[PDB]
Write an enzyme that holds these catalytic residues in place. Structure first.
Site, mmCIF file in Angstrom:
data_model
loop_
_atom_site.group_PDB
_atom_site.id
_atom_site.type_symbol
_atom_site.label_atom_id
_atom_site.label_comp_id
_atom_site.label_asym_id
_atom_site.label_seq_id
_atom_site.Cartn_x
_atom_site.Cartn_y
_atom_site.Cartn_z
ATOM 1 N N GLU B 160 -9.535 2.965 -0.412
ATOM 2 C CA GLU B 160 -8.428 3.727 -1.049
ATOM 3 C C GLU B 160 -8.704 3.955 -2.539
ATOM 4 O OE1 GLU B 160 -4.681 1.734 -0.026
ATOM 5 O OE2 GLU B 160 -4.524 2.964 1.738
ATOM 6 N N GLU B 240 -5.906 3.440 9.177
ATOM 7 C CA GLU B 240 -4.959 2.359 9.107
ATOM 8 C C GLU B 240 -3.538 2.743 9.560
ATOM 9 O OE1 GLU B 240 -4.855 0.662 5.301
ATOM 10 O OE2 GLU B 240 -6.955 0.098 5.144
HETATM 11 O O1 LIG Z 1 -1.088 -4.002 4.403
HETATM 12 C C1 LIG Z 1 -1.184 -2.946 3.465
HETATM 13 C C2 LIG Z 1 -2.568 -2.294 3.446
HETATM 14 O O2 LIG Z 1 -2.573 -1.233 2.515
HETATM 15 C C3 LIG Z 1 -3.711 -0.409 2.729
HETATM 16 O O3 LIG Z 1 -3.625 0.850 2.097
HETATM 17 C C4 LIG Z 1 -4.922 -1.159 2.234
HETATM 18 O O4 LIG Z 1 -6.069 -0.326 2.386
HETATM 19 C C5 LIG Z 1 -5.066 -2.467 3.043
HETATM 20 O O5 LIG Z 1 -6.152 -3.234 2.512
HETATM 21 C C6 LIG Z 1 -3.744 -3.234 3.106
HETATM 22 O O6 LIG Z 1 -3.457 -3.784 1.859
#
Ligand SMILES: OC[C@H]1O[C@@H](O)[C@H](O)[C@@H](O)[C@H]1O
Ligand SMILES: *[C@@H]1O[C@H](CO)[C@@H](O)[C@H](O)[C@H]1NC(C)=O
Ligand SMILES: *[C@@H]1O[C@H](CO)[C@@H](O)[C@H](O)[C@H]1NC(C)=O
Ligand SMILES: *[C@@H]1O[C@H](CO)[C@@H](O)[C@H](O)[C@H]1NC(C)=O
Ligand SMILES: *[C@@H]1O[C@H](CO)[C@@H](O)[C@H](O)[C@H]1NC(C)=O
Ligand SMILES: *[C@@H]1O[C@H](CO)[C@@H](O)[C@H](O)[C@H]1NC(C)=O
Ligand SMILES: *[C@@H]1O[C@H](CO)[C@@H](O)[C@H](O)[C@H]1NC(C)=O
Ligand SMILES: *[C@@H]1O[C@H](CO)[C@@H](O)[C@H](O)[C@H]1NC(C)=O
Ligand SMILES: *[C@@H]1O[C@H](CO)[C@@H](O)[C@H](O)[C@H]1NC(C)=O
Ligand SMILES: OC[C@H]1O[C@@H](O)[C@H](O)[C@@H](O)[C@H]1O
Ligand SMILES: [Cl-]
Ligand SMILES: [Cl-]
Lengths: 605, 603
Positions: B160, B240
């Site tokens: 990110e 994600e």
């Molecule tokens: O659980 C929240 C998540 O947020 C995402 O955007 C990040 O890439 C992860 O590493 C984790 O922190």
């Protein structure tokens, strides 16, 4: 120097000079796999029991004269050491008859090679065999006696001999002499008999302390007065306070209420009596070890018994309620209790038919058959347990159904009948002594005869098995028999030879595999196997004989499967021998299957 | 030979020349004991996933420069071979910054030896460290690429980056180059950013396939439109897809409804998109591995996430619901699923006081203290995690309550204050920067300072820890410090050297035995601290993490059975920082309890 004795002046036991009484629980090491011995014994301790009581089944240790089994699941010495390491004492009951809903009450079947033997008497042939067994067993028990550093405080001679017809006091004297010879003069020797003068008459012996048994339907005062009549001084002892009861195929599952057991246990303890809980854990009659009652009714595979610990060792409401009773009299051990084991529903596993029994005869009977004019019994043919095939030829054409019969009712206990490989149905001890057959002159008549369990109580424990009297066809005695003892256990361990040696269907072996992943800390787990659509038979997993199934009769539908016989990565091989009807003709192979579930069903309609 | 590639012509991945999409779940090998790696991975496969995704946390593997941990629970290569053995492909995310609710976003703290370092940029010292790290890690990952017979099909560059303020494209380009030198020209390299042009602006890069992330709250058509702007052709990818959300100490436990996850998951899959469920199993932040957000708010020990698999691997209703969505798109493996592990309530185990921190300084600090005129940070003192004791003498007399203060809010992150061994109370980052104290002149002023976890996201990831600025007493700057770095882990392993309203920070210890020869013992359990306030806990020397029943939502800590023994007694050690229920004439109150269910969602 350690001492255990009855104190007559004070109606008490003395342990190293201190007053003692025991609160015991029956566990049969032959009905629990060794893998779980410690588990059950530890749960027994945490309940507040300070001793355990067990039976030594002779036939479990000497399946042929002078060939002994004292290792693995037969290692009674280790079991007793395990009890001692946990701080439990032991009440040993070595018989030589134990009753116990166990094949022939523990007596070996090869005792019947003398056809007229009177069992449990001074019959010189019975005595000589008993004596040789005692010469092997008792020296192994001697260093385990309390006074020699082990856990054994008392030892039972015979088992409710007062219930048997013979009333042979010489018998009982010979056992006493022999127990004394091997164990010494200090060990406390006792008897157990029903709590009534009519049972105590022939059960009681000078020199052996007289204890009683009774359960939750007995008046406690009357029962202990019955004991007091035979022993005016010494401890009150109920050697078998029934926590539950036995089953029979076809009858509902016996239960006894938690509250009745708890209240009676409270009353017994409050009198200062020593008490043994029969059964504290029941377990399982694996293979062909179950017994039967007369008139012929076999006990099933489960010996759950409705005991405080269930068949699979689970902690039940009854366990906890009894523990709470015991807490009122003694300080029970601290800390958490080892739990009920995890159970796993592995699901449906398809089987397929491998071979009929008739086609597997070369492998089941590799030394070949015994030829005889008239039929021979299991004992004569040197087989004690399982199945024997009896074969002849039809001496007449039976295109019209002719009666096949055993006029004296000597199919002991079930025959699966076929004529040139066409199943004809069943003959049954006491129920159906005639069955109509058809076939041509000179057709092969096969009867697969099953020993369902030797009677273990009453006058009729000399229960030979097989075709014990003649068969007739159309009233004429059938002669010229070819008789194959079946080495079912070996054949199953070899996958009927496949792995080398390093309405009805024909009795047949059905096999199927399932896998269980490795690297999973909680697999394998215990399970329960169920046979929807099957009828009656024997089941093995990786060659371990789990016992008999009979969902057609109940009350037991599932059989208990302990996790240690299951394997990971390597395929687990289920073998089913179906005797009567298999759900496996039709064009749906999914019907030809068993199912593993995670709760027992031993309490069915 | 094997091939994995993006076919831009066809808007798809091609595996061995055939169309491919993945349905993946995140599992962090660093948060699950290796003893349970196969359990979690086979539950994942039986859910219907054809892949897993993991982060490689640099600091988990390179705790000091040129000292590596790749064995046992740190064995990433093994974990990937395991996934491969089970028929799972891998999406590897080796950072070097992974975010992940994990200590400093995976970045080693020793990078902060350079005070001015600009983390996640082309700062040449950052790049030199990164580059040595890549030169040890990626040659290990090379044979595990799909094209060389291993499981790794795609590899994420950074994490990110569009969310970070630096917007240094040369940093991204360096990473692409060094990833290419070590992995070759064929590996599918990709980036992940939030699904909005404002996040993709500084996150996206030519030659790295742009993917987005988003959860159940997002408009799925808009999310993929924001990605298509960046990559007009190739597979849609939600790297994600949030099954749940993170927690912070003192805030309610987060949850996301099963029907929402199922609903979106079905909608994503139906579009032919590849998707990774974050997290599928969360697991646990053992020891000091948890991260933090800005303004300073630490995440708890548990990383359950309200994932489809619970912290302890349990099959949840969420798990079965998602398995059931996946089944509508792909035949799922046959057979029974491995079960939720049995849990055992060991019950109550009484502890007693062993040593205060004050009285254990010989074993905790066997090198001797550091004298400094003004306070030094954790980094300058060469300690990264845990606790450091700062000590000075009182200059004036404080018969009456004097203000002790960190006027620039420079207690990072919490300080347990004592004057002559009388607890005074507590200073809190961003919350309590003044505490009134008393004591004589010459009295020993002690501040036990806790690193509660380095911020893992935002600008302020350069999170040094300790007393980062000066402390004043009655407005005068406190000088002349005696600073003790504490070897808590060795001290606890050695039973504090004894081998063969507030209380003083102190270690409490006790024992419990488990019977041997019981096939189903030991079992997993949950440890609970009724009466205690805040601290750290080890069982048999293994640091299970932090407890804080004073704040919640987490009351229990997960204890995995493989660290419990039956051949000798098991030892529990507690470091209570605030208040221990062990002064009473009742030793039975000085005790923790093991229960058979988690409490991670107390109000
Ligand atoms: O659980 C929240 C998540 O947020 C995402 O955007 C990040 O890439 C992860 O590493 C984790 O922190
Ligand atoms: C039991 O028997 C005794 C006499 O032996 C009798 O007096 C008593 O009332 C009976 N108890 C019960 C519960 O029936
Ligand atoms: C056998 O068949 C005869 C007819 O020949 C019939 O009378 C009798 O009921 C049958 N017996 C049995 C046992 O089925
Ligand atoms: C069978 O038949 C004959 C009677 O003719 C008898 O001699 C024999 O003892 C009988 N055998 C059995 C086993 O009943
Ligand atoms: C079952 O397993 C054994 C090997 O373990 C093998 O001999 C037998 O043929 C197997 N059948 C199947 C379908 O795997
Ligand atoms: C998402 O946004 C589009 C416009 O981009 C709109 O058509 C659609 O209704 C939205 N979907 C949902 C579920 O709100
Ligand atoms: C001393 O500490 C108290 C307790 O909170 C604080 O409120 C107060 O401001 C301080 N008193 C003085 C006189 O500074
Ligand atoms: C503390 O105080 C003095 C300024 O009065 C200064 O030399 C030093 O920078 C300060 N140190 C820290 C760590 O804040
Ligand atoms: C072990 O733990 C027990 C708790 O029951 C405690 O009494 C004992 O002192 C401990 N022993 C050692 C060596 O710490
Ligand atoms: O479970 C019923 C019990 O009945 C008793 O008479 C016998 O002594 C026991 O061995 C057992 O048969
Ligand atoms: Cl017994
Ligand atoms: Cl991930």
């Amino acid at each position: 120097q350690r001492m255990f004795e009855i104190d007559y002046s004070r109606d008490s036991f003395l342990k190293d000079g201190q007053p003692f009484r025991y609160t015991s629980g029956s566990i049969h090491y032959s009905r629990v796999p060794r893998f779980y011995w410690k588990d059950r014994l530890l749960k027994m301790k945490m309940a507040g029991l300070n001793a355990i009581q067990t039976y030594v089944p002779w036939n479990f240790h000497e399946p042929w004269p002078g060939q002994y089994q004292f290792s693995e699941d037969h290692d009674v010495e280790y079991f007793l050491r395990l009890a001692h390491e946990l701080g439990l004492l032991v009440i040993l009951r070595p018989g030589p008859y134990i009753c116990a809903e166990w094949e022939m009450g523990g007596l070996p079947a090869w005792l019947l090679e003398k056809e007229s033997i009177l069992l449990r008497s001074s019959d010189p042939d019975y005595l000589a065999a008993v004596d040789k067994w005692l010469g092997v067993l008792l020296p192994k028990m001697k260093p385990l006696l309390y006074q020699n550093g082990g856990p054994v405080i008392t030892v039972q001679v015979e088992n409710e001999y007062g219930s048997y017809f013979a009333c042979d006091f010489d018998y009982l004297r010979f056992l006493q002499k022999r127990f004394r010879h091997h164990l010494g003069d200090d060990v406390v020797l006792f008897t157990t008999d029903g709590a009534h003068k009519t049972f105590l008459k022939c059960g009681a012996l000078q020199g052996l302390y007289t204890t009683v048994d009774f359960g939750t339907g007995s008046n406690i005062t009357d029962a202990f007065l019955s004991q007091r009549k035979c022993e005016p001084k010494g401890p009150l002892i109920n050697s078998e306070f029934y926590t539950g009861w036995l089953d029979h195929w076809g009858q509902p599952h016996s239960t006894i209420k938690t509250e009745a057991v708890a209240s009676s246990l409270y009353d017994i303890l409050a009198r200062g009596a020593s008490v043994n809980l029969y059964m504290f854990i029941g377990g399982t009659n694996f293979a062909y070890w179950n017994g039967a009652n007369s008139p012929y009714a076999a006990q099933p595979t489960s010996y759950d018994y409705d005991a405080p610990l269930s068949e699979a060792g689970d902690l039940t409401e009854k366990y906890f309620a009894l523990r709470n009773i015991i807490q009122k009299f003694e300080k029970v051990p601290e800390g958490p209790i080892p739990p009920s084991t995890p159970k796993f529903a592995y699901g449906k596993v398809t089987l397929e038919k491998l071979k009929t029994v008739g086609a597997a005869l070369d492998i089941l009977c590799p030394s070949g058959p015994i030829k005889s004019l008239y039929p021979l019994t299991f004992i004569q043919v040197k087989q004690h347990y399982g199945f024997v095939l009896y074969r002849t030829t039809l001496p007449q054409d039976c295109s019209n159904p002719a009666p096949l019969s055993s006029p004296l009712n000597g199919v002991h206990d079930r025959a699966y009948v076929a004529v040139d490989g066409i199943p004809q149905g069943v003959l049954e001890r006491n129920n159906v002594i005639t069955l109509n057959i058809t076939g041509k002159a000179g057709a092969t008549l096969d009867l697969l005869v099953e020993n369902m369990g030797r009677v273990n109580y009453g006058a009729y424990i000399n229960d030979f098995k097989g075709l014990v009297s003649n068969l007739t066809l159309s009233s004429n005695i059938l002669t010229d028999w070819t008789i194959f003892p079946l080495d079912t256990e070996d054949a199953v361990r070899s996958h009927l030879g496949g792995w080398g040696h390093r309405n009805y269907t024909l009795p047949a072996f059905y096999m199927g595999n399932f896998s269980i992943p490795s690297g999973i800390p909680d697999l394998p787990q215990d399970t329960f196997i169920q046979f929807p659509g099957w009828t009656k038979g024997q089941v093995w997993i990786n060659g371990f004989n789990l016992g008999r199934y009979w969902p057609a009769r109940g009350p037991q539908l599932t059989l208990f499967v302990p996790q240690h016989i299951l394997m990971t990565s390597a395929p687990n091989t289920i073998t089913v021998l179906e005797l009567e009807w298999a759900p496996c003709s039709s064009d749906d192979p999914e019907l030809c299957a068993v199912t593993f579930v995670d709760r027992p069903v031993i309490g069915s309609s």
